[PDB]
Amino acid sequence: MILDTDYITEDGKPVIRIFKKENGEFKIEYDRTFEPYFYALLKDDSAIEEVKKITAERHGTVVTVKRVEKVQKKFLGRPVEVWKLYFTHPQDVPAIRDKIREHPAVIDIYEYDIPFAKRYLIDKGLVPMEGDEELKMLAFAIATLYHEGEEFAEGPILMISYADEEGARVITWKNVDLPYVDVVSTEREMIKRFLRVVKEKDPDVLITYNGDNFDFAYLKKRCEKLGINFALGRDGSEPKIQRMGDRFAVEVKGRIHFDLYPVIRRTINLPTYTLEAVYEAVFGQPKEKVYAEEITTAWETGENLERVARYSMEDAKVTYELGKEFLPMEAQLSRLIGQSLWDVSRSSTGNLVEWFLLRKAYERNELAPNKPDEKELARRRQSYEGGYVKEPERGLWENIVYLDFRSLYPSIIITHNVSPDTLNREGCKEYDVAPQVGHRFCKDFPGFIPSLLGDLLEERQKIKKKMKATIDPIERKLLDYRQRRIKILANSYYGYYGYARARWYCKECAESVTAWGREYITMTIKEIEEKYGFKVIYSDTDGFFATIPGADAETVKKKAMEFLKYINAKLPGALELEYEGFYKRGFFVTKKKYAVIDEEGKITTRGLEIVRRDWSEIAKETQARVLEALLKDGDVEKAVRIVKEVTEKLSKYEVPPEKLVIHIQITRDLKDYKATGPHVAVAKRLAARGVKIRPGTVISYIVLKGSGRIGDRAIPFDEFDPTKHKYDAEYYIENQVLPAVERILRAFGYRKEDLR
DNA sequence: AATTCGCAGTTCGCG
DNA sequence: CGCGAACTGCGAA
Numbered sequence A: 001m002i003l004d005t006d007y008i009t010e011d012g013k014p015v016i017r018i019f020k021k022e023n024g025e026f027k028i029e030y031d032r033t034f035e036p037y038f039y040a041l042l043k044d045d046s047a048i049e050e051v052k053k054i055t056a057e058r059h060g061t062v063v064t065v066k067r068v069e070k071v072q073k074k075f076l077g078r079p080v081e082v083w084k085l086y087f088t089h090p091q092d093v094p095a096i097r098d099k100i101r102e103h104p105a106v107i108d109i110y111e112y113d114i115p116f117a118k119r120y121l122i123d124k125g126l127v128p129m130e131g132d133e134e135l136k137m138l139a140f141a142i143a144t145l146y147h148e149g150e151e152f153a154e155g156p157i158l159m160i161s162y163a164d165e166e167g168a169r170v171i172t173w174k175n176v177d178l179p180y181v182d183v184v185s186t187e188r189e190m191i192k193r194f195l196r197v198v199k200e201k202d203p204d205v206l207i208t209y210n211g212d213n214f215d216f217a218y219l220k221k222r223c224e225k226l227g228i229n230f231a232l233g234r235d236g237s238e239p240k241i242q243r244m245g246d247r248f249a250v251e252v253k254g255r256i257h258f259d260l261y262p263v264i265r266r267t268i269n270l271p272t273y274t275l276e277a278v279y280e281a282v283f284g285q286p287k288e289k290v291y292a293e294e295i296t297t298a299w300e301t302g303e304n305l306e307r308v309a310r311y312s313m314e315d316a317k318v319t320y321e322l323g324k325e326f327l328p329m330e331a332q333l334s335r336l337i338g339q340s341l342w343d344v345s346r347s348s349t350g351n352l353v354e355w356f357l358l359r360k361a362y363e364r365n366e367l368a369p370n371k372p373d374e375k376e377l378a379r380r381r382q383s384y385e386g387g388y389v390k391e392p393e394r395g396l397w398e399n400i401v402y403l404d405f406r407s408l409y410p411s412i413i414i415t416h417n418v419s420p421d422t423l424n425r426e427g428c429k430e431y432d433v434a435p436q437v438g439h440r441f442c443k444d445f446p447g448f449i450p451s452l453l454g455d456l457l458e459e460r461q462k463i464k465k466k467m468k469a470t471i472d473p474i475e476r477k478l479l480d481y482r483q484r485r486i487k488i489l490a491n492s493y494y495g496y497y498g499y500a501r502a503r504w505y506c507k508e509c510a511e512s513v514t515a516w517g518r519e520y521i522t523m524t525i526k527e528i529e530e531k532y533g534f535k536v537i538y539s540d541t542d543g544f545f546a547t548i549p550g551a552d553a554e555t556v557k558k559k560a561m562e563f564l565k566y567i568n569a570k571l572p573g574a575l576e577l578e579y580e581g582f583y584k585r586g587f588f589v590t591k592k593k594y595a596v597i598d599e600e601g602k603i604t605t606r607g608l609e610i611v612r613r614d615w616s617e618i619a620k621e622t623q624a625r626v627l628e629a630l631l632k633d634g635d636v637e638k639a640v641r642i643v644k645e646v647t648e649k650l651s652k653y654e655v656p657p658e659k660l661v662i663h664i665q666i667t668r669d670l671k672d673y674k675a676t677g678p679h680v681a682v683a684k685r686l687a688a689r690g691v692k693i694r695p696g697t698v699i700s701y702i703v704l705k706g707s708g709r710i711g712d713r714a715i716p717f718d719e720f721d722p723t724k725h726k727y728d729a730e731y732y733i734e735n736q737v738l739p740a741v742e743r744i745l746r747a748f749g750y751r752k753e754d755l756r
Numbered sequence B: 001a002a003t004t005c006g007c008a009g010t011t012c013g014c015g
Numbered sequence C: 001c002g003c004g005a006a007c008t009g010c011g012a013a
Helices: A046-053 A092-102 A114-123 A187-201 A212-224 A260-267 A275-283 A292-301 A304-336 A350-362 A374-377 A408-416 A448-469 A472-491 A494-496 A507-530 A552-567 A619-633 A637-651 A678-687 A729-747
Strands: A002-010 A014-023 A027-031 A037-044 A057-060 A060-065 A065-076 A079-088 A106-110 A135-145 A156-166 A168-170 A180-184 A206-207 A240-244 A247-251 A256-259 A394-403 A432-433 A438-442 A535-540 A541-549 A576-589 A593-598 A603-607 A664-665 A700-704 A714-716
Touching: A002 A114, A002 A256, A014 A114, A027 A240, A037 A046, A037 A092, A037 A256, A046 A065, A046 A079, A057 A092, A060 A092, A060 A156, A060 A593, A114 A350, A135 A187, A135 A212, A135 A292, A135 A304, A135 A350, A135 A408, A156 A212, A168 A187, A168 A304, A187 A212, A206 A212, A206 A260, A206 A304, A212 A240, A212 A256, A212 A260, A212 A678, A240 A535, A240 A603, A247 A256, A256 A260, A256 A304, A260 A304, A275 A304, A292 A304, A304 A472, A350 A494, A374 A700, A394 A408, A394 A507, A394 A552, A408 A507, A408 A535, A448 A472, A448 A494, A494 A507, A507 A541, A507 A552, A535 A576, A541 A576, A552 A576, A576 A619, A576 A729, A593 A619, A603 A619, A619 A637, A619 A729, A637 A729, A678 A714
Parallel strands: A135 A206, A168 A180, A206 A256
Antiparallel strands: A002 A014, A014 A027, A037 A079, A037 A106, A057 A060, A065 A079, A135 A156, A156 A168, A240 A247, A394 A541, A394 A576, A432 A438, A535 A541, A576 A593, A593 A603, A664 A700, A700 A714
16 A cells, blocks of 8 residues: 655655555655656757757756657647656756746746656556555644743643554653553653654554644744654654645655644534534534643643643544544545545645546646646636526425436536537537537547546446445445545536636636536426426526425425426436425525425525524524424414524523624735724734734634624633623624524514514 | 635725 | 625535
């Protein structure tokens, strides 16, 4: 099993290192033969003698062009001829590529920005994370001494905790009477002891929660003060810290540093992303939080260090438990994309698709398009029409069926061969013509993207068949993860087409896809209304809710089945309308906001305040309780009673403040805000006392009595003291509870004042 | 750093 | 000095 690749430099030449885990044993394969290269396209071949002579400087060392070779590849499915330019060292290409491009005889250059080690995985057909290998895993966490107004890592680490399959332990340098605490005398001995534990356990994976941006940097700065060689790497090296523009990321060579924080943030939508919140969300059991002020107080008073140790022990143990949950999923993604678990677990959607496409393009001798420069990026910010959204017939409905397309956008890409290499390609026998926008797509041969999509959707079906017949539960679960990653990959091509930073950007493909989608969905609505008597209540992009007014449940279901038989004999290719479910009642609030209840009693809510992080729990919990009264019992008087009780509970100050918190994410540097909302105003108070407010930070505030602007009265919930602070019951009634229930109960005759 | 389509709370500036 | 626009955030698909 391949884990990662990198390269070192020996006597001026690059040496690829392949980190493997084969049959329980860690190994390093070296490859000294791979040469870095990019491609150039010339106005004329004789200019190759001119370009061969171009040189550059790499702080001191003079960079030349090692060797050139003419090659023939396809660019967008068309044959082209370029010059492959080899170099002795990978760091030669950034120092020289701009000089070769700026030549008047060089038209452009291609594949000039592929990192050497990832280039190696692609060119050599290697795939990380394949085969029967258990990785040994170890999670860890630190606890520090914090005082407000000090630099980063001015204060010592107090505890390093770790957990794996054999338990959890805490290393600390005061006496704590707990069986899982090991005591040493100094912070230096504690860090050294933790070095030894990692070197002794020799894990394949190190799991942190936000180690990319706190734990490793803290350890780095302490190890510098204390004079410690921080040698975590299997090759004896120190953690390698790398800037990914805004934040940081940390490699441990020979190991996989699995940081849960970017993984969880990309995988699940939660109101906050504290370790305690993530654990309760994934596992359903509470984790108590101990705050920095308590940790410092306990350390300097020496009182209640047991509580700090237990908190530290639990940090590692839930971090390990979350590692076990999410690592296999990310391993399959790494195996699917063809890049390291380290890389993919920190990659956006667009980067993931692109690395997939670069490997597939290599295997088909397709020269890759370039990322856009500034001129081209500007040109690319024209938008296009999206999915169809019917304005709903607002209110309460009985006996609803939801009908929709099985994978509308990938079905359109497959069926109509929507690809930039088929777009308006002249001289074919057969084309499909996108409605409204007019783009022609050749059908004589499968496009690059359509072919990959077809392969993907077919592999997913073989896996599902293989899961149902396989007898090995670990194989079945890995298979499950792989077909899930494939579904997500396949559903990413559409958005990638319209992504201006994409190498394979194609506004025409993307707007063709949505145009075909609007055609298919609206023709279907028209047919079910005019030929089958249905009333279509609401519809968004690829599906719609419908009923027969005044028909019983079993009529609606059967007439829907018949319509499906009718419409699917008219839908071309892979387009298929499916019976997704029957809902006994549904309430449609606005476009993109509704709730339905199925015959079993389960309620599904979309877009409503219930699903949002920036609404208080008391609002959400109250709206949810209203929706049960209506959907489940059809009981409007109960719904009104529920809201009357809640506004009174707030008015007499008996709602717990924990249900009053509002969560809003900071989305940028704070000086780039043109207008200061309440959450920006709280984040400015906090940042003015040394707390870091990078983008992605979730402000958790509560609104206090007094008045003026909401921002003048907002404080972090951590700062809320129920003996010097009174929350604004009028704000939570007039601006939170009633605004979420009013748009629903307006359908029965109630106004906000009948609800107080 | 996937897309467009959409709702709504806060704040501020203007007749 | 109420109101609309602007900014802002987070949803659906």
